[PDB]
Amino acid sequence: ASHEERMNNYRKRVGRLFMEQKAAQPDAVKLPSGLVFQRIARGSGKRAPAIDDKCEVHYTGRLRDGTVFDSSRERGKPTTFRPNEVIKGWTEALQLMREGDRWRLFIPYDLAYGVTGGGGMIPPYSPLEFDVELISIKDGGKGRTAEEVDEILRKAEEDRED
Ligand SMILES: CC(C)C[C@H](NC(=O)[C@@H]1CCCCN1S(=O)(=O)Cc1ccc(F)cc1)C(=O)NCc1cccnc1
Ligand code: NA
Ligand code: NA
Ligand code: NA
Ligand code: NA
């Protein structure tokens, strides 16, 4: 095995251990895609964004070792994204969040920057950790209802072992 293969095998191994350890947290929820989240706060909003709604958020992104690769909080002002403009783990999570929700997201590499990595700071095969707060959705949000979301999340917890 070449060095690159051995290095990426290592990256995949420790990344998978990280994902497993975070999914085993009692308040963590694992979704079928592989996305894991913990609720930091439950918002009072009643609608999740649609795939093309503009979401105002505060976030901090960290690698498995805690290194911060990007943070709107450090910039002192929120950032606005649509779900269809962001990595797959965020696209999925945002459509399951309502205004005021604050989540810790644990994103496996295949729902993040994948085999190439990104930004110079995220190497190949990196899981990512985000603390994300959904502050507002432009014009209220045209996605799932709070009740639709909660059923998905309830049912997701039920079928964890499946
Ligand atoms: C301007 C922004 C809309 C772009 C967007 N950003 C993100 O989706 C993530 C999550 C949301 C917060 C922002 N970040 S981030 O903080 O992780 C970026 C980052 C990475 C590495 C680093 F070193 C520093 C920062 C992006 O990349 N989309 C392209 C794409 C889509 C699907 C698959 N792959 C790539
Ligand atoms: Na971390
Ligand atoms: Na939610
Ligand atoms: Na990644
Ligand atoms: Na990566």
Author numbering: 5 to 166
From the paper:
In all cases, we found that the inhibitor molecules bound within the expected FKBP-like domain cleft that forms the MIP active site. For LpMIP100–213, the affinity for the tracer was significantly lower than that for all other constructs, thus requiring a 5-fold increase in the protein concentration. Both NJS224 and NJS227 were able to displace the tracer and yielded displacement KD values in the low to medium nM range for BpMIP and TcMIP and in the low μM range for full-length LpMIP and LpMIP77–213. In agreement with very similar KD values for either ligand, the distinguishing moieties, i.e., the iso-propyl group in NJS224 and the para-fluorobenzyl moiety in NJS227, do not make substantial protein contacts and furthermore face in opposite directions. In BpMIP and TcMIP, hydrophobic residues in this region (V62/I63 in BpMIP and V90/I91 in TcMIP) interact with the inhibitor pyridine group.
Macrophage infectivity potentiator (MIP) proteins are key microbial virulence factors that facilitate host cell infection, intracellular pathogen replication, and dissemination.
